[PDB]
Design a binder for this molecule. Structure first.
Ligand SMILES: *[C@@H]1O[C@H](CO)[C@@H](O[C@@H]2O[C@H](CO)[C@@H](O[C@@H]3O[C@H](CO[C@H]4O[C@H](CO)[C@@H](O)[C@H](O[C@H]5O[C@H](CO)[C@@H](O)[C@H](O)[C@@H]5O)[C@@H]4O)[C@@H](O)[C@H](O)[C@@H]3O)[C@H](O)[C@H]2NC(C)=O)[C@H](O)[C@H]1NC(C)=O
Ligand SMILES: *[C@@H]1O[C@H](CO)[C@@H](O[C@@H]2O[C@H](CO)[C@@H](O)[C@H](O)[C@H]2NC(C)=O)[C@H](O)[C@H]1NC(C)=O
Ligand SMILES: CC(=O)N[C@@H]1[C@@H](O)[C@H](O)[C@@H](CO)O[C@H]1O
Ligand SMILES: CC(=O)N[C@@H]1[C@@H](O)[C@H](O)[C@@H](CO)O[C@H]1O
Ligand SMILES: *[C@@H]1O[C@H](CO)[C@@H](O)[C@H](O)[C@H]1NC(C)=O
Ligand SMILES: C[N+](C)(C)CCOP(=O)(O)O
Ligand SMILES: [Zn+2]
Ligand SMILES: [Zn+2]
Length: 528
């Protein structure tokens, strides 16, 4: 009588569910997990215990409601007859039935046309506990801070402004960055795409994260005054890291604490309609100029590390569908769109990344620019047509981090964009990157001087910065090692590794530049 296997299975995981709601059961989960953390020497025992205690409540709940829920587990184990396993199942959003206009590249701007200057800040990762002189090569996942201890007598401690290691930034270096903006300005707007807290991820309270949010927010507001700042939500803003429950999760373990703090912190910059969307799911749209829409995406609903998506990964918060409606509205008015976000779309979950790719291809004429960060390095992602994966039609700019993490100079970015006038293409025309050379800045008594590292069109000889120039650059770099070495230099903000990047390293790096869609190896067919 195997007619009972499904009854008993469901009875098992129903009892599993009830047991895992009990906090002493959750603590049992945490204790074993910590001993394995110590046994597998993942981190120091202090970090192992702290991070499991911080994560255990939310993670046990998600597993209880997804992988261990009776309908899911028994569906995996006994098949569609018993339950239904649909964890990370494929999904698709709906495009409107409006015919796609003919593909049309942006027009060259007329002589003397207005140029809008956009400051781009990402991955600031302020470390409230940064401490000069401490060990940069400590045993914790983040060093140069209180509790990192002392270096050996053979190596120096963490530099005053930062270190070339697994360390984040003292607030004074963030202050130095914004205080040196004058040469690079003036700015019409600032795009600020996430990651305010540091990587002290094993002990972050909601108050620490809010303190990071409110302190840095006030700092940029002090140095940029009247200039609008459009933020986007990074993966480090929440606690625990990457924990962004979609709006179908209510109660105090939801993201309400964080989104509302953002709506109050960013009220000076965001219109009422933006603040409403922001409070719901951490994304919004607004109009910087007549004929220009800006859309700030919360890419944590695309993230491979947002463990809440194990419950349901299908277009969380309805964001992609909301994006389509916003983009079609822009197409209807003839507006152009900027997209800003944190995690670049090539690094998203499979289904999300594929649907985003399809949206970008549909709205190629309407999308004018895309801006992401999160990787901390200086790179890009080229988008191609759906039909042949060979006509370049969009490019995402991945700007490098202000934080040193890991081992880099601090950096930031400025875009020259086809400006504020009727008929403008609103596309990026050129960009520039500024760095703080820590080797020089950390000399005792020196005053930090942020330097221009490079300008895009000048150093690569680009006629413009449209998608085809970046496509072309990748294939020039396939055959020109010196050119690729330049790019590899700039990629690390002027502080590349000493291990040379040979043939496999180059091909893997070039393949990432063409991988705007996750898990699409065909995109790199011409590289390997
Ligand atoms: C995880 O979340 C997703 C979404 O949040 C859940 O998917 C929804 O599931 C419910 C069932 O519980 C579906 O309800 C059915 O919808 C039928 C038709 O609905 C159409 O119109 C909807 C409202 O305008 C519209 O959202 C939807 O568009 C999209 O969904 C289609 C799949 O449903 C998809 O193929 C399209 O590409 C498009 O993106 C529909 O066209 C209706 O006939 C049924 O009676 C019933 O109402 C929702 O439609 C689902 N919505 C989406 C976007 O998929 C999913 O169940 C959750 N998973 C778990 C395990 O909870
Ligand atoms: C950061 O500052 C260091 C320190 O001066 C620069 O390194 C020097 O680079 C020049 C040019 O290659 C050499 O002649 C010196 O010998 C270097 N000094 C040392 C101590 O290595 C470095 O080039 C700067 N980096 C950037 C990106 O500006
Ligand atoms: C008495 C009873 O329940 N019999 C069913 C039988 O009709 C069915 O074909 C089989 C398939 O699982 O399961 C059992
Ligand atoms: C739920 C659903 O409709 N999924 C489909 C998927 O099966 C298909 O492979 C994909 C095409 O890329 O389109 C979507
Ligand atoms: C942009 O141009 C329009 C039309 O000339 C003007 O009204 C507006 O003040 C300008 N600036 C912004 C930020 O919209
Ligand atoms: C993603 N990364 C590990 C390469 C860069 C640092 O991560 P993160 O600070 O953006 O979360
Ligand atoms: Zn970051
Ligand atoms: Zn990040």
């Amino acid at each position: 009588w195997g007619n009972l296997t499904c009854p008993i299975c469901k009875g098992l995981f129903t009892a599993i569910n009830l047991g895992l709601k009990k906090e002493p059961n959750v603590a049992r989960v945490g204790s074993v997990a910590i001993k394995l953390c110590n046994l597998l020497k993942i981190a120091p025992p202090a970090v192992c215990q702290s991070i499991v205690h911080l994560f255990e409540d939310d993670m046990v709940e998600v597993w209880r409601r997804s992988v261990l829920s009776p309908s899911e587990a028994c569906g995996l184990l006994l098949g569609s007859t018993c339950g239904h396993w649909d964890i990370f199942s494929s999904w698709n959003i709906s495009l409107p039935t409006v015919p796609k206009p003919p593909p049309k590249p942006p027009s060259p701007p007329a002589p003397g046309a207005p140029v809008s200057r956009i400051l781009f800040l990402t991955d600031l990762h302020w470390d409230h506990d940064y401490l000069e002189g401490t060990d940069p090569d400590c045993a914790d996942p983040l060093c140069c801070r209180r509790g990192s201890g002392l270096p050996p007598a053979s190596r120096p401690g963490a530099g005053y402004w930062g270190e070339y290691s697994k360390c984040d930034l003292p607030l004074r270096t963030l202050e130095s960055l914004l205080s040196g903006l004058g040469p690079a300005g003036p700015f019409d707007m600032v795009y600020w795409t996430g990651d305010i807290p540091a990587h002290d991820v094993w002990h972050q309270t909601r108050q620490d994260q809010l303190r990071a949010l409110t302190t840095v927010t006030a700092l940029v507001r002090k140095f940029l005054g009247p200039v609008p700042v459009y933020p986007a939500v990074g993966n480090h803003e929440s606690t625990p890291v990457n924990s962004f429950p979609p709006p179908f999760i209510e109660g105090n373990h939801s993201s309400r604490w964080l989104y509302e703090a953002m709506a109050k912190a960013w009220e000076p910059w965001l219109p009422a309609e933006a603040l409403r969307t922001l409070r719901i799911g951490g994304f919004y749209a607004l109009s910087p100029y007549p004929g220009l829409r800006l859309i700030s995406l919360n890419m944590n609903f695309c993230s491979r590390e947002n463990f809440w998506l194990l419950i349901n990964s299908t277009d969380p918060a309805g964001q992609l569908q909301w994006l389509v409606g916003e983009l079609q509205a822009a197409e209807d008015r003839g507006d152009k769109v900027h997209i800003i976000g944190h995690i670049p779309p090539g690094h998203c979950l499979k289904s999300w990344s594929w649907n985003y790719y399809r949206i970008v291809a549909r709205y190629e004429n309407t999308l004018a620019a895309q801006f992401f960060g999160h990787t901390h390095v200086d790179e890009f992602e080229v988008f191609y047509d759906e039909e042949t994966l060979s006509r370049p039609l969009a490019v995402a700019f991945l700007a490098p981090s202000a934080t040193t993490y890991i081992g880099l100079n601090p950096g930031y970015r400025v875009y020259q964009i086809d400006g504020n006038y009727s008929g403008s293409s609103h596309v990026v025309l050129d960009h520039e990157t500024y760095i703080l050379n820590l080797t020089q800045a950390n000399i005792p008594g020196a005053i930090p001087h942020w330097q221009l590292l490079y300008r895009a069109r000048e150093t690569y000889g680009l006629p413009n910065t449209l998608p085809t120039a970046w496509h072309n650059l990748v294939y020039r770099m396939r055959g020109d090692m010196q050119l690729f070495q330049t790019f590899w230099f700039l990629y690390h903000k002027g502080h590349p590794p000493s291990e040379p990047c040979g043939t496999p390293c180059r091909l893997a790096t070039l393949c990432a530049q063409l991988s705007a869609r996750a898990d699409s190896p065909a995109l790199c067919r011409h590289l390997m």
